[PDB]
Write an enzyme that holds these catalytic residues in place. Structure first.
Site, short mmCIF file in Angstrom:
data_model
loop_
_atom_site.label_atom_id
_atom_site.label_comp_id
_atom_site.label_asym_id
_atom_site.label_seq_id
_atom_site.Cartn_x
_atom_site.Cartn_y
_atom_site.Cartn_z
N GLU A 53 74.17 22.79 105.26
CA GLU A 53 72.79 22.29 105.18
C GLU A 53 72.40 21.56 106.49
OE1 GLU A 53 71.92 18.64 103.26
OE2 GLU A 53 73.75 18.78 102.03
N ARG A 64 65.36 10.78 106.20
CA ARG A 64 65.55 12.20 106.43
C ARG A 64 64.61 13.03 105.57
NH1 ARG A 64 70.24 15.69 105.93
NH2 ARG A 64 70.79 14.27 104.30
N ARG A 68 64.92 20.88 103.95
CA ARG A 68 66.22 21.27 104.52
C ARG A 68 66.24 22.77 104.69
NH1 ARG A 68 66.18 16.48 104.34
NH2 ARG A 68 67.61 15.10 103.09
N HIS A 84 64.01 18.87 98.17
CA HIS A 84 65.35 18.29 97.98
C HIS A 84 66.22 19.08 97.05
CE1 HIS A 84 68.13 14.86 97.68
NE2 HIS A 84 67.64 14.62 98.90
#
Length: 95
Positions: A53, A64, A68, A84
């Site tokens: 990831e 953050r 992703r 997420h």
């Protein structure tokens, strides 16, 4: 997996993360590159170490954030999640 999304439809920061993945970094966060354990996810089942990831930055956030990219081992097998790891789409780098 949710469907396939053209890279041009994703935030620009997802292009920046794919370009760091292509150069092997250097990455902004020490969690970029760690193995993603796909055990509870909707990704195709694979053994430990197949997925990794990386952060897609969210401009302005103080953390953050929730965006992703997960890579798999196959050629151009890369998935984006904006929430997420609740849902994923396969990225199509050709559109």
């Amino acid at each position: 997996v949710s469907g396939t999304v053209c890279l041009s439809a994703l935030p620009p920061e997802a292009t920046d993360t794919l370009n760091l993945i292509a150069s092997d970094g250097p990455f902004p966060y020490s969690q970029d590159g760690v193995v993603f354990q796909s055990r509870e996810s909707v990704l195709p089942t694979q053994s430990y170490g197949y997925y990794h990831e990386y952060t897609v930055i969210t401009p302005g956030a103080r953390t953050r954030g929730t965006r992703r990219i997960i890579t798999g081992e196959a050629t151009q097998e890369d998935y984006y999640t904006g929430d997420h790891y609740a849902t994923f789409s396969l990225i199509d780098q050709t559109c």
